[PDB]
Amino acid sequence: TGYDLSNSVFSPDGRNFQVEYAVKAVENGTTSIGIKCNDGVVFAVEKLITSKLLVPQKNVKIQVVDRHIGCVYSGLIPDGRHLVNRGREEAASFKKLYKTPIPIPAFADRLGQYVQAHTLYNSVRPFGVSTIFGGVDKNGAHLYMLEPSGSYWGYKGAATGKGRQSAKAELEKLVDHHPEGLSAREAVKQAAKIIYLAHEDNKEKDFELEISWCSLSETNGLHKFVKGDLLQEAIDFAQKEIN
Amino acid sequence: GSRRYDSRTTIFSPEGRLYQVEYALESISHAGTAIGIMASDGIVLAAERKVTSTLLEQDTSTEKLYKLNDKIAVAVAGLTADAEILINTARIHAQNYLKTYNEDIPVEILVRRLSDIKQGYTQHGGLRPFGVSFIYAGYDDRYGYQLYTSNPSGNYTGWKAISVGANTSAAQTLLQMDYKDDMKVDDAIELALKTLSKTTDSSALTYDRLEFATIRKGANDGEVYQKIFKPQEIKDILVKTGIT
Amino acid sequence: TTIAGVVYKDGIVLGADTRATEGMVVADKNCSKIHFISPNIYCCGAGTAADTDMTTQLISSNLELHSLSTGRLPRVVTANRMLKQMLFRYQGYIGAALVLGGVDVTGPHLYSIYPHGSTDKLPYVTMGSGSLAAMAVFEDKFRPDMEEEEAKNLVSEAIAAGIFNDLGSGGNIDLCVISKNKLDFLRPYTVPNKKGTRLGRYRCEKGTTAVLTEKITPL
Amino acid sequence: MTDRYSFSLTTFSPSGKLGQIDYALTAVKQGVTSLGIKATNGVVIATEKKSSSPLAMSETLSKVSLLTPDIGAVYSGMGPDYRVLVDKSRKVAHTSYKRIYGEYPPTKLLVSEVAKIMQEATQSGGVRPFGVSLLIAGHDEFNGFSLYQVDPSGSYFPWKATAIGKGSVAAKTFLEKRWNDELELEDAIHIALLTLKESVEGEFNGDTIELAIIGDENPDKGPRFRKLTSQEINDRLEAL
Amino acid sequence: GYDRHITIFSPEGRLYQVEYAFKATNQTNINSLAVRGKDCTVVISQKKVPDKLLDPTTVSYIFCISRTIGMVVNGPIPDARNAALRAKAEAAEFRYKYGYDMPCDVLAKRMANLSQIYTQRAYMRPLGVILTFVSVDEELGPSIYKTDPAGYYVGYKATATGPKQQEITTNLENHFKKSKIDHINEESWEKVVEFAITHMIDALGTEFSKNDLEVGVATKDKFFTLSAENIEERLVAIAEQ
Amino acid sequence: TSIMAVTFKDGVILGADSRTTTGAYIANRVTDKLTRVHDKIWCCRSGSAADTQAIADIVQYHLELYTSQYGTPSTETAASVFKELCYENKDNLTAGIIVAGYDDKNKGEVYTIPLGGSVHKLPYAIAGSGSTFIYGYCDKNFRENMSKEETVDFIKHSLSQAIKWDGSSGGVIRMVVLTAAGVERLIFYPDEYEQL
Amino acid sequence: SDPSSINGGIVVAMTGKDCVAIACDLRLGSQSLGVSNKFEKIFHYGHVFLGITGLATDVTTLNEMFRYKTNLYKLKEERAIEPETFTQLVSSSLYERRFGPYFVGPVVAGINSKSGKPFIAGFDLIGCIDEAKDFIVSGTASDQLFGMCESLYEPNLEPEDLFETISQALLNAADRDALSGWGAVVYIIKKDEVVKRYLKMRQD
Amino acid sequence: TQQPIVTGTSVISMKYDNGVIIAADNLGSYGSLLRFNGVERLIPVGDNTVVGISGDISDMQHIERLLKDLVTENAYDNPLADAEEALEPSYIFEYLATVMYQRRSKMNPLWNAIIVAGVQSNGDQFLRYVNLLGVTYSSPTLATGFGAHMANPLLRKVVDRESDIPKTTVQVAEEAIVNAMRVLYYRDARSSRNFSLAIIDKNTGLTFKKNLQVENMKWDFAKD
C-alpha cells in the first residue's frame, strides 16, 4: 500500500487512486446537467442556497467560453474556474491563428489534454470537477462531459454531481421518448424539471435554478443565459411536474 | 510531491558525519589496493586489479593508473566510471592552467581543484558523492616530487608513502615499518610490491593482477618521464624483486 | 567555379571544374567540388568554399544518423530540405550555392540550392561564376531522357565552356554519374589543359642559401 | 510539471553498495545470453533472437547494431534501454568526434563515451541506471581489433572473449577452454555458435540467432562491420 | 517499498510501475486485431457503448495519425489521446523537416523511445496504453508496428491486443501455419476486413452487429475508418457464405 | 512574376507565369509558382523565392496538423495562417501571396496577402511585377460566375499581356483548376498565348 | 585597419621525397614600425607542424588553443595526432568562429607516422582547406610566394635540395614585401629527424 | 520600425447636441496605386462606439481583432455585459491609447491614427484621437492626416468651440461631414468617392451607413 498517497502512481490494479479520490469530490458537489437538442445544447445547474444572505441570481456558476461555448461543472468550484480560464486561452489562441471560432470537439480535446496532464506528475493534483460543456459549431450541436482522469465523450444528455443517478434516469427517458429529437425550448423546460427531480438528493437546503443555452435558431448559435420570463416559464413547468 | 523519495545525500548525522561520504569510503575499502611511495629520485605507483579472469585483455586495460598530464598521474580506488569523470575534469584544468600561464600546473593546485569538486557534491546539489579515492603522483619545480591522496569528502593530504582501497590499515603499518627518507626508487618499487604481496586477498600476487608505474626525473637532461609499466615489464620486476 | 547537373534517362550526371581561387590567384588547380551527402546523393558546391564544405558535411552527417535510425536510404528531398531550411535560417550569410543530385526510391532528382534558402527542382542546372557559359551549352544541346554517355558529354561540354570562357573556372573536369544500378565518381573525367612545361631549371644548388645556425632533434 | 527529481535515485547504502546498479545488474542477468569472441583477424559478437511471439517479425528487432562502419554492439538486458544507448552512441560518434577530426572514433573512445552516458544515469538527478550490459566489438587503425564490455555502473573492461546475461557463467567457462591467441575469425564464429547453443532452449538456426563480425573491409575504406545473413549462419551450422 | 511507486529497479531487477501500466492497458475490456493483405493493412477493434446517453459516433479508439498512418489504442482514452496527439504532431514535424511522409515503423520507434523515457525518468509516469500503428508503407508495404508502456516495439505479420489477446493470437497463428505466408492473400481490402472480422468471431466466440465493431483500413496513400453501414455491408457478406 | 487567382461558377482557377530572374539573368524559366498547401487549397507566390517557399512549407505543415485534429480546413483558415506568418514577420519578409481554395460549402474563394501582411478577400486577384500592366485589362474584362473555359481564357489573355510587357515575367503560363470534380493542372506555351 | 596585414609576415610549406619543409619569416610590426625580429610563426604538436600568419594575437591564441586540444587528444587516444587528423581539427576550430573569425592563415606540415606519406595543407581564415601536394603559402607576401614557388618548385626533392628551394622562395618573396622579413626560419622535417635552420637575410 | 504599405486616408468626425458623427472613405491605397476599393475603416464596438482608423491597413486589421477580442473578454463572467458593465467609448479608447504608446515605446508602432467616437453611459459625447506616437487629444471636431488640413476648417465653422455643440443638430452635423468628404475627394489624391458614415446618438443609438457617395460635383468650370 501507499499507492493512493501520490498522484500519477499506478496501483497494482492499474488504477490512479488520486484521480478516483478527485471523483469523490465531484460526487460530493451539486447537481449539474447538459441536454443536447435539435440545433443546440442546454446547460442547467443546482445552486444550493446555504443561507438567506446569498444574493439571488448573483453567484453565477455557468461560464461562457469564446462566444459560442457554455461550461458548467460540479465539485470544487475554483478548479472548474481554473479549467475554464485555460479553455478561454485555448479558444483564443485557436481563433487567433485559424480565424474561425474553435470547434466543440477541438475545444473538448483542449480541456481533455490539460486535465489529463494533471494525472501525469506527483507535483500536481488532479481536477476536482466533472465538466459538462458544449455549443454550436459549423458541424452543428455538440454536448460533452469531462472527468478528472481526462476522459471525455460526446453525449445526448449528461449529468454529474450528487444527484447524477436521478438525473441520468430522467435523461434516459427523454432519449427513448424523443428519437426524432428535442427542441431548444423543450430542452430548457426539461432541464428545469431534471434539476428539480435531482434536488431530492440535496433536499435539506432549498436551491436556485440556473439555465443557459446555445441554439442555432433561438440564440444565433451564441451562448446566452436563460433569464426572466423564459426562466420563470421553465421553473413553473418544473414545479408542476414534481407536484 | 518528489520529497518523499529524496535520500538527502548532503546532510550531517547526529554525530557530525556525512552519511554518504562514510558509506562511499566503505565502498572504497572493498576496492583493489593502490599504493604510492615517494623516493628522493622518483615516485612509485602500484595497484592491484580485481576479480580478473584469464580472458581479460590486460595490455589494453586501464582500471587503476591514469595519466593527467606529462608530470602528474593518479592511482584509483573505487568506481572506475566515477574516476574517469573526475580524471577528464582534471586533465582539462591542467590544460586551462597551461593555456593561461604558459607553465605546467603545480601538483597541489590540480589536487585542490579536484578535491574542491568532490567537496561540492558533499555540501550541495543533492547528488551522491563520487565513490573514488585518488593517489596523485606528480612533479613540479617548486616542491619536486609529491604524493597526495583525496577521498569522497574532498579532503586531501600529502604523503611520503600511502595506500588506498582494501586493507589500508595493514598496508600502512607495513609501509610505516620499512619506509625511510633516504630511500630510492628501485627500493620503493620493491617495498610497494612486498606490501601488496602481504595485504592481497588473492592467494598469490601475479603480473596479470597488477598495474604499475614510475615518475622519474631519472631521464637524460633532467626532465620528468612517466612510465606506465607494460604486462611483460610488471612480470620482470616481480621476478627481479623475488616475489614469483 | 563552374558546376552543373543534368537529369538523364537512368539518373543524374553532376559536373564540376577544379579551380579554387583567392582573389585573382589560384590556390589549388585540382580541388574537389563534388561532395558526398549519402551513397545515392552527391552535391556540387559553388560560392564560399568553407560554407559549401561544412554545410554539405553537416547535412551528410545528419542524413547518416537519419538513415541508420530509419534503416533505409535517404531521399534527395530530405537532403534538399535540410540544406534549404538551414541556409534560409542564416539569411544568406552562409554563402553556399549547391547543385544537389541523387537517386531515390522515387527516381532521380536534381536541385539547385541558393545561399538564401530557395531551391529549384530542374532537369538541368548550372551555378558559379561560369554558370552562364555552362547554361549556354545546355540551352544549345539539352534534351530530356538522354542516354548516359550523351549526358556525360553534355555536362563535360558545359563545364568546359565555363573553364575556358570564365576566368573564375579552370583546371580539370570532374563528373559524378548516379543511377539505380551504380555510382560512378570520375575524378578527373577530362584534362582539357596540359600543365605548362618549363624550359629552364631554376632550382638552386646545395649551399647557395646563407644559414646562420642549425639544430637537429630525433623523434 | 516540475521535474522535481533533482536528487540522486542511486545512493550508497551503509554496506557501500550502490543498490540501483546491483539491481540493474540483476536485470542484465535475467536477460538473454549474448557473447563476444576476439580472433587475430577479427571479432565476432552473437546473441539469441528471443522472439516474443511467432507472429512478430524478429528481423525488424535488431539486437546487434552498427555504431560506426568499424564498430558493432550487442547487449543483454532491457532492449529499450539498449536502443537509446545505440542512438546516443551513433550520435556522439559524429558530434564529439567525426565533425571535429574528420574520421570515426576508435573503439576504446566510443566505448568510453557510452560508459560516460551510463555513469551519468548512475549519479544524475531523477534517473535510474540503464538496465543493460553492452558488448562492443570494433576495429581502428592504431589499436587494431578489440572487444569491450560495458556495465550499468559505467565500468568497462576489454576482453579476449566473454559472455553476459542468462547463461554467462557457464558460457565464460566454455570460452576459457576454447580460446587461444591464434584463432582465425572463422574459428571464433565456430566457437561462438557452439557456446551459444548451450544457453538456447528451443530452435537453433539462422532465423533465431543474430551474429555479426568486425573483420576485413567490405567493398576511402570499406566498412569492417558485417551482420551475417540467415543463410550464412545455417551454412556454418552444418559444419558444427 | 517505494521501488513500486516510481520507475526504479526492485531488487529482482523489475519496474513495477511499467508492469502496472500494462495492467491499465486492459481496463477498457476491448480486444483489437490487425492483419495485412497484399495491398492493405486492416485493423479491427471491439466497440462498446454501455451508456445509452453516449453519442456513439464519438466513442472511438482508432485514430488517423497522418493520411498514411492509422493507430488503434488498447488502454484508457485519456492516455490514448495523449499518445494520439503526440504521434500526429511527430508525423507533421517529420514531413516538414525531412520532406517525405513519416513511415509507420519510424513513428512506432519514435513513440517507443518516448515511452522508454517514462520508464527511466522518475517524474514522468508511463502511459497505460499499447499503440498498434498501421499503414501501407511506400518502401516496406503493408506494415503493423506495436508499442507498449515498456518502450518495446516490433513489427508484426499480424497481431492482437487486449484481455482475450492470447485466444485471438493463437487463432491467427494457426491460420498462418496453414497458408504458410505472412499475409492475407486477397486483392480487395473489403475481403481482408471480412477475414479480420470472421477470425475475431471464431476466436472470441461472439457474433457482432454493425455497432459492436470499429474498423480501420490502410491502403497506399490513405488510411480511413469504416462507417457503421460500411461494416454492415461487411457483416452481410460474411453471413451469406 | 505575374500571378492571379480567379473565382468562377464551378470554383476557382490559379494562374502564373514561370520566369525567375536574378537581375537580367533568367535563373529558372520553368518555375512552378503555384504551390499546394492542401488538397484543394493552393497559393500563388511572388516576392523572395526563399521567403515564399519557407512560408508555403510552414503553412502546409500547419494545415496538415490542422487536418489530423479538426478535419479539412477552410480556405479562410489557410489565408489566416499565411497572414499570421506574413504580418508577424513583415520586417524580415518580402512575400506577396494569393491564396485560393475550393470548399463545397463556400465554393471558390480568393484571398490576397500583399507586402504589409493585410488580408483581402476578392472575386479575383492579380499580383507580382507584371500585374501593374493588366489592372486596366482585368478590370474591364472580368465578370462573375464565368464558365471554366471563359476563366481559362480570361487568365490566359491577362497573363499573356503581363508577360509581353514585364521582363521579370515570361515562359509558360501554368494554371491550376479547383472544382468539386478535383484538381486539374493546365499549361500553355509561348507559341499559343503570344499570338492572342 | 585590415587585421591580416597589421603585424605582417609569411609562411610557406613544401613537400619533397620522404620529407616536408615549412618556413617562416621573423617579423612582427605595427604596420610600418618594426617591433620584434624574434616572432616565430611555426609551432609543433608532436610531429605535426603548424605555421600561422596574420594577426599576431590570434597566431598566439591559436597556437595555445591547438596545444591544448592536441594534448587532450594524446591523453585520450594514447598516441600523437597525425597531420591529416590535425588538418580537420584546424578546419573545425576555425569554422566554429565563422561569423567572428581568427584573422589567420594557417599551414599544416608533417609526415604521417604510420604511412610515411608527406603531408601539407593550408586554410583560409574560416577553415576551408587548401589540400595541395606541391606547396602552401600564406601571409602578406603570399602572391610573391605563389610566384616563387610555381617557378622554383618541382616534385620529389631530396631534403637539402628542398631546403634551397623553400629558402629562396621565402627570402626573395619577403624582400618584395615591406611587412615581411627581419630574419627567417626553415624546418626540414623527415620521418625521424627535424632540422631547424635560421637564415641570413637583409634586415630592412 | 516598419513602413506603412497599404494605407487608409482621412477619418473625419464631429460632436453635435446629442452625439457624435464619424466618417471615412472605403479605399486602401498601395502608394499611388488605388488598390482596394472595398475597405471598411469604421469598426463599431458594441452599440455605443465606433473606432475610425487611418494609416496602415494590416495594423488596422490587427486593431480590429483586438477590439473584437475585447468584446469577447468583457462578456466573460459578466452578467451585465449587455447593460451596466458593457464596454464604454472611454474604456475602448484608453485601451487603444495604452497599446499605441506601449508600441511606440518598444520602437515598433502600430502605424495608425485612430479616432474613437461614441456616447457614454450618462449620455456624454465621446470623441478622442490617438496615433502611432501615443499622442492623444480631444476637440469638438477631429480629423486624421489630410482631413486635419481641409475637413477641420469646414467643420470648425459649424462647431468652433464647446458652446456650439448643443446648438448643432444631427442634420447640420451630417451635412457638414458629407460636405467635408466631398471637399476631400476633390483635393486628396489618395481618397475615394465611396465612403462610410456612422452616427452614434444618445437617443436613436448607432446608425451605420454604408456605400455612400460624393455627389453634387462641380466640374463645369474646367471646359473654359
Ligand SMILES: *[C@@H](CS(C)(=O)=O)[C@H](Cc1ccc(CN)cc1)NC(=O)[C@H](CC(C)C)NC(=O)[C@H](CC(C)C)NC(=O)c1cnccn1
Ligand atoms: C568557386 C566559387 S565562385 C568564385 O563563386 O565561382 C570555388 C568553389 C569551391 C572551391 C573550393 C572548394 C573546396 N572545398 C569547393 C568549392 N570557390 C572559391 O574558389 C572560393 C571563392 C571565394 C569565396 C569568392 N575561394 C575561397 O573560399 C577562398 C579559400 C580557398 C582558396 C581555400 N577564400 C577566400 O577567397 C576568402 C577571402 N577572404 C576571406 C575568406 N575567404
Ligand SMILES: [Cl-]
Ligand atoms: Cl527519438
Ligand SMILES: [Mg+2]
Ligand atoms: Mg516514472
Ligand SMILES: [Mg+2]
Ligand atoms: Mg517577357
Ligand SMILES: [Mg+2]
Ligand atoms: Mg623585406
Ligand SMILES: [Mg+2]
Ligand atoms: Mg623594415
